[PDB]
Amino acid sequence: SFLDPKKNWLAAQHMKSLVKRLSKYGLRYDDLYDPYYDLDVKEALNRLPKEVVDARHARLKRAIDLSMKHEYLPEDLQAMQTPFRGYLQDMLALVKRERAEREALGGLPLYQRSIP
Amino acid sequence: ADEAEHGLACPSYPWPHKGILSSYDHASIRRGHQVYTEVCASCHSMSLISYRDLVGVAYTEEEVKAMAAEIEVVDGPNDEGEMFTRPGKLSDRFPQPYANEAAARFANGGAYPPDLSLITKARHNGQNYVFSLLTGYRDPPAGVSIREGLHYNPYFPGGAIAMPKMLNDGAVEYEDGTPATEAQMGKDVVSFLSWAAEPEMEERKLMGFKWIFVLSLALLQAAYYRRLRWSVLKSRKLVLDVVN
Amino acid sequence: GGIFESLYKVVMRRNSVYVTFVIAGAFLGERAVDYGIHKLWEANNVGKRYEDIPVLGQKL
Amino acid sequence: EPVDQKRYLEESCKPKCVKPLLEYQACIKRIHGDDSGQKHCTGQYFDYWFCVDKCVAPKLFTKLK
Amino acid sequence: TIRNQRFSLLKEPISSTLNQHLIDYPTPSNLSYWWGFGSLAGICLVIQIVTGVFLAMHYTPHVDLAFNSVEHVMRDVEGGWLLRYMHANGASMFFIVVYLHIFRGLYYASYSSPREFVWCLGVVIFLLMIVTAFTGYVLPWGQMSFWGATVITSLASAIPVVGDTIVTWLWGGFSVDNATLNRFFSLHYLLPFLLVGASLLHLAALHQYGSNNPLGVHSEMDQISFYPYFYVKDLVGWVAFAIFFSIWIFYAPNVLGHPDNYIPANPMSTPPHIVPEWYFLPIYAILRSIPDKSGGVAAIALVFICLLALPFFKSMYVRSSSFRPIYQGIFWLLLADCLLLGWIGCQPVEAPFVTIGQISSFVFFLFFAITPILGRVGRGIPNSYTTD
Amino acid sequence: KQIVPVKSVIYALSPFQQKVMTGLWKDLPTKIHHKVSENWISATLLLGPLVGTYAYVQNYLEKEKLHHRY
Amino acid sequence: QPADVKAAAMWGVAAATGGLYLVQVSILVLP
Numbered sequence: 001s002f003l004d005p006k007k008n009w010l011a012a013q014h015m016k017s018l019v020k021r022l023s024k025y026g027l028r029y030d031d032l033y034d035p036y037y038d039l040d041v042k043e044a045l046n047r048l049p050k051e052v053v054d055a056r057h058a059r060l061k062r063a064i065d066l067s068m069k070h071e072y073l074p075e076d077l078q079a080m081q082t083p084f085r086g087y088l089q090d091m092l093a094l095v096k097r098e099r100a101e102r103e104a105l106g107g108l109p110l111y112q113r114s115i116p
Numbered sequence: 117a118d119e120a121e122h123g124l125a126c127p128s129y130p131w132p133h134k135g136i137l138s139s140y141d142h143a144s145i146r147r148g149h150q151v152y153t154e155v156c157a158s159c160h161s162m163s164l165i166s167y168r169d170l171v172g173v174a175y176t177e178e179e180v181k182a183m184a185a186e187i188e189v190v191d192g193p194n195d196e197g198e199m200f201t202r203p204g205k206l207s208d209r210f211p212q213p214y215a216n217e218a219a220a221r222f223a224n225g226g227a228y229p230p231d232l233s234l235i236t237k238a239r240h241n242g243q244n245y246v247f248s249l250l251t252g253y254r255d256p257p258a259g260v261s262i263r264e265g266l267h268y269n270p271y272f273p274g275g276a277i278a279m280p281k282m283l284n285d286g287a288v289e290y291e292d293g294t295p296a297t298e299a300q301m302g303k304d305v306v307s308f309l310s311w312a313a314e315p316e317m318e319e320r321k322l323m324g325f326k327w328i329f330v331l332s333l334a335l336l337q338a339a340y341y342r343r344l345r346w347s348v349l350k351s352r353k354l355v356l357d358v359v360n
Numbered sequence: 361g362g363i364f365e366s367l368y369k370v371v372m373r374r375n376s377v378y379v380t381f382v383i384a385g386a387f388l389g390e391r392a393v394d395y396g397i398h399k400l401w402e403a404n405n406v407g408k409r410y411e412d413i414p415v416l417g418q419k420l
Numbered sequence: 421e422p423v424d425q426k427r428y429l430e431e432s433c434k435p436k437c438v439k440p441l442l443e444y445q446a447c448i449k450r451i452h453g454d455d456s457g458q459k460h461c462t463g464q465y466f467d468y469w470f471c472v473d474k475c476v477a478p479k480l481f482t483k484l485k
Numbered sequence: 486t487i488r489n490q491r492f493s494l495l496k497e498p499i500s501s502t503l504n505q506h507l508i509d510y511p512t513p514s515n516l517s518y519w520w521g522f523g524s525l526a527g528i529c530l531v532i533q534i535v536t537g538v539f540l541a542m543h544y545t546p547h548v549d550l551a552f553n554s555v556e557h558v559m560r561d562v563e564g565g566w567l568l569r570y571m572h573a574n575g576a577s578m579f580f581i582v583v584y585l586h587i588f589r590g591l592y593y594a595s596y597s598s599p600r601e602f603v604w605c606l607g608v609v610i611f612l613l614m615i616v617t618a619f620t621g622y623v624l625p626w627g628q629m630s631f632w633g634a635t636v637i638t639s640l641a642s643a644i645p646v647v648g649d650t651i652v653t654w655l656w657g658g659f660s661v662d663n664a665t666l667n668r669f670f671s672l673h674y675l676l677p678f679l680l681v682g683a684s685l686l687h688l689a690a691l692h693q694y695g696s697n698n699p700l701g702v703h704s705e706m707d708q709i710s711f712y713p714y715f716y717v718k719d720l721v722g723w724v725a726f727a728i729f730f731s732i733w734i735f736y737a738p739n740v741l742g743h744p745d746n747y748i749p750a751n752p753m754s755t756p757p758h759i760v761p762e763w764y765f766l767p768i769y770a771i772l773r774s775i776p777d778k779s780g781g782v783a784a785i786a787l788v789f790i791c792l793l794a795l796p797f798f799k800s801m802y803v804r805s806s807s808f809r810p811i812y813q814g815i816f817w818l819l820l821a822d823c824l825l826l827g828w829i830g831c832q833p834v835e836a837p838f839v840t841i842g843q844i845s846s847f848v849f850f851l852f853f854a855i856t857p858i859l860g861r862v863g864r865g866i867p868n869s870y871t872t873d
Numbered sequence: 874k875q876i877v878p879v880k881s882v883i884y885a886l887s888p889f890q891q892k893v894m895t896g897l898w899k900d901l902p903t904k905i906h907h908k909v910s911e912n913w914i915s916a917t918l919l920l921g922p923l924v925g926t927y928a929y930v931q932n933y934l935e936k937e938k939l940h941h942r943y
Numbered sequence: 944q945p946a947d948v949k950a951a952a953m954w955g956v957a958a959a960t961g962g963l964y965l966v967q968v969s970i971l972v973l974p
């Protein structure tokens with residue numbers, strides 16, 4: 001099934017908690033995708049515009065600094081935060097679709113993970 | 117019946133050596149050793165406590181030398197090749213009442229009186245258990261019949277123990293002027309056994325106190341050092357050119 | 361402040377002097393802690409030590 | 421000396437554990453009445469003596485020298 | 486930068502590798518005190534090795550002299566009681582800090598890509614630790630040591646085809662006897678050095694990919710060198726561990742032990758309560774809970790299968806559990822279940838402990854059987870909560 | 874394993890121009906408020922099963938003890 | 944060079960003090 005916060009109270013609570021956490025650290029949900037994790041995220045980030053990727057790096061650095069200092073974003077910017085305003089899922093889906101097509105008919109992987 | 121199999125739990129007595137800065141009552145150790153060598157040495161053996169262990173704890177060196185010279189010990193082959201016997205020395209160990217475990221069992225009707233060197237560490241809750249077992253020789257409840265030749269002890273796992281009550285009131289004459297009651301002998305013997313099972317308690321506790329205190333001071337300094345090193349990072353202001 | 365700066369200019373201008381000071385302080389502090397803990401031990405358990413039993417020398 | 425500190429203090433704290441002793445006595449009554457197979461109630465005995473020993477433990481060493 | 490002349494003795498080839506991988510290795514600037522446990526398990530291993538060597542200068546692996554030799558170290562050797570208590574309570578500390586290491590990894594999903602090799606080498610290290618601690622615990626030759634060795638090695642005869650053959654080969658005879666004691670001593674001496682090698686490979690893989698962080702995000706933007714920023718942090722950790730260890734050496738030296746081990750081993754008598762050390766208890770509990778002992782050994786193998794299979798699960802792009810409420814609750818339930826299962830191991834095999842251990846094992850395996858489902862379902866979160 | 878520059882501007886201060894150990898106990902009640910408010914779910918999940926199982930075990934043990942105690 | 948000699952002498956003094964503190968030969972030192 002597909003459970004969205006409009007048709008599920010539990011999903012509404014889950015989304016509320018995720019929004020609260022991400023707003024506390026001031027970073028979008030897409031910023032949690034590690035380029036070293038999948039290597040499809042690496043390609044999707046390689047294809048995105050430099051302004052967007054630089055904003056992602058700045059938000060991540062701010063979050064890491066706040067984590068070290070053991071504090072949260074001040075309430076002003078916390079109210080100014082916009083989590084779940086995605087910038088990466090469409091490109092990641094395109095990359096994965098292209099990889100699936102290439103794998104499906106002949107083709108060698110365009111990139112591979114080292115061992116390990 | 118599971119209750120009887122486990123045995124009645126023994127309470128928590130306030131031993132004079134229980135704490136963080138309490139030592140053995142060495143007078144109690146001396147009295148307990150006297151009780152052991154008078155009544156318990158006939159059946160149980162230590163075989164891990166040398167005579168030299170007693171000097172500076174319960175007796176003086178002259179007393180220990182005389183006590184060792186009291187007994188006889190077999191010695192290695194002489195120039196003629198025979199196994200002879202000589203009076204004991206300071207470095208010898210406590211004598212063994214029986215040549216071997218089978219001899220002990222035959223003497224005691226199939227029961228082996230365990231070595232008492234580590235009896236306070238071999239048994240769970242050793243000190244309280246030994247004191248209660250020595251002093252708790254009570255009457256069995258209604259309906260229970262102990263098989264002939266055994267004696268009932270509630271704190272003994274199983275209910276019936278092979279030794280009778282040995283700490284009989286007025287069995288030893290203390291050399292210092294202490295009335296020998298069953299509780300007195302029990303406390304003294306448990307003190308002696310606990311020393312024999314842990315002769316390092318005093319030095320061990322002194323080292324522990326000193327090093328806990330000193331390492332707490334080190335921990336305070338290490339925390340200050342860490343907070344000083346990280347003070348540059350944990351108070352920086354960075355401008356990032358991003359808002360949301 | 362003044363006392364700390366004064367002892368600093370005394371003993372923190374050469375690292376060899378600092379190492380000598382560290383070793384000497386460790387030794388003196390160790391001996392002082394030994395003495396203090398021993399005094400606490402004596403105060404706590406009095407009447408139990410070896411040279412206290414009334415009949416220490418009468419087993420002959 | 422005929423006196424015994426442990427027995428003395430057990431007798432002294434006997435009236436402070438009345439309920440387990442009453443239950444044990446009732447069970448003695450029941451077992452004597454039945455007297456059929458091998459029934460016994462060491463449980464009451466254990467409870468009563470455990471509570472008595474828990475009582476006696478500190479005063480015994482306080483009064484012991 | 487042409488290295489015509491020497492600048493820094495740290496950058497010279499003699500100290501260059503140490504310089505890089507210890508002083509200058511960049512680490513995320515937001516690591517908490519939960520990484521000090523990884524830094525501290527190595528210290529525990531070094532303590533174990535040194536105390537063990539100095540103990541082996543006094544231990545005799547014969548069957549008529551092992552117990553008396555251990556008591557010789559207790560009593561006659563100057564400072565010997567310190568050595569023996571250090572070795573025993575240090576095995577306990579080693580396992581405590583390694584458990585904290587493992588559970589931090591589980592909480593922050595450090596096993597996820599690209600540190601599969603780090604986690605797998607950690608699992609191999611765990612096997613080595615377990616075998617070393619067991620074969621070492623057999624050495625003092627007490628009642629618990631002898632009978633635990635008998636029970637556990639005899640429960641290796643569950644393999645269908647070979648079974649008794651492997652058991653006879655392992656025992657060196659027909660029962661746990663002098664040959665097994667000598668063999669166990671030699672193996673106990675050897676294995677810690679393989680453990681040092683495995684630890685070095687563990688660290689090499691981690692340094693290949695770099696350490697994780699509480700947020701679980703990519704962290705090559707804000708990084709600082711290891712020395713001195715994390716050296717002082719690990720120093721605080723070490724001193725706190727030293728206070729803990731000093732408490733456990735000088736005031737409660739036998740609390741973590743089992744009193745029946747202070748009885749010389751007697752093959753003609755069995756102690757009423759044969760149980761392993763507290764840090765084998767969960768494994769023992771699973772083994773006993775599953776009946777049909779062959780099934781128990783299969784379950785014990787399956788535990789390590791699950792541990793090795795953790796890093797190779799589904800997408801689960803978000804890894805840190807600070808942003809995973811459901812996985813956070815699941816992790817806390819897992820930790821509670823592991824503690825409860827460890828408690829169950831010491832209990833007898835009577836009721837209701839059988840049922841409590843049978844449910845606990847099922848929950849423990851359900852943890853591993855549920856996380857891929859969590860990842861699969863959460864793969865489609867952004868499309869549902871988006872604010873477009 | 875590369876560095877990713879961010880184009881920041883960072884002001885830092887000497888470690889000897891700012892107090893060190895005061896921030897530990899500065900603003901303590903709010904710190905305890907956070908520690909308890911954001912974690913009570915986790916403590917409940919960690920301890921609830923344990924105390925519940927202990928209570929169940931003690932209840933069962935006592936009931937069996939009474940039943941079997943004749 | 945004189946400064947180097949003074950530094951070497953002070954470091955030798957420090958090392959001697961460290962060795963003395965490690966061995967504790969207070970009993971041995973008769974002269």
Ligand SMILES: CCCCCCCCCCCCCCCCCC(=O)OC[C@H](COP(=O)(O)OCCN)OC(=O)CCCCCCCCCCCCCCCCC
Nearest residue numbers: 109112113114115116601602605606609789790793794797
């Ligand atoms: C315990 C009892 C004994 C028996 C145990 C049996 C196994 C149980 C658990 C099985 C778990 C899965 C095993 C299969 C390996 C993983 C499969 C997989 O998905 O690998 C792919 C992954 C990424 O590769 P990818 O980029 O997808 O490939 C390009 C292809 N288009 O590939 C990678 O990411 C590469 C990972 C490299 C590291 C792998 C480490 C495996 C474990 C090694 C342990 C021993 C290490 C050696 C030292 C000790 C020796 C004793």
Ligand code: HEC
Nearest residue numbers: 155156158159160224227228229230235246277278279282
């Ligand atoms: C000095 C007064 C004595 C002390 C202290 C102890 N005993 Fe004995 N003892 C004897 C036998 C034949 C046994 C075996 C009984 C059995 O294992 O069932 C014992 C046993 C003990 C135990 C073991 C308790 C346990 O296993 O939990 C302890 C702690 C003990 N004894 C202490 C025989 C004799 C004996 C011969 C008549 C004498 C003089 C003593 N025991 C004296 C003491």
Ligand code: HEM
Nearest residue numbers: 533534537538541544569573576617618621622624625677
């Ligand atoms: C090369 C390093 C090591 C050597 C030489 C060594 C040697 C010994 C020796 C001689 C004993 C018997 C003495 C005694 O029982 O106290 C022993 C016991 C033991 N060792 Fe080790 N050991 C080493 C490393 C380790 C490690 C790494 C562990 C933990 C994983 C460990 C765990 C134990 C345990 C649990 C005991 C039993 C202690 C007891 O109950 O008395 N040893 N070891």
Ligand code: HEM
Nearest residue numbers: 520523524526527590595596604607608610611684696697
């Ligand atoms: C001999 C015992 C062990 C030692 C000495 C050891 C050592 C280390 C060290 C030094 C690190 C780097 C510092 C740190 O991240 O905390 C580390 C990290 C790690 N270890 Fe271990 N380890 C041991 C056991 C284990 C085990 C048993 C596992 C799991 C099976 C494990 C899994 C990990 C993981 C996942 C990391 C990465 C931490 C991160 O997220 O950055 N380790 N270990």
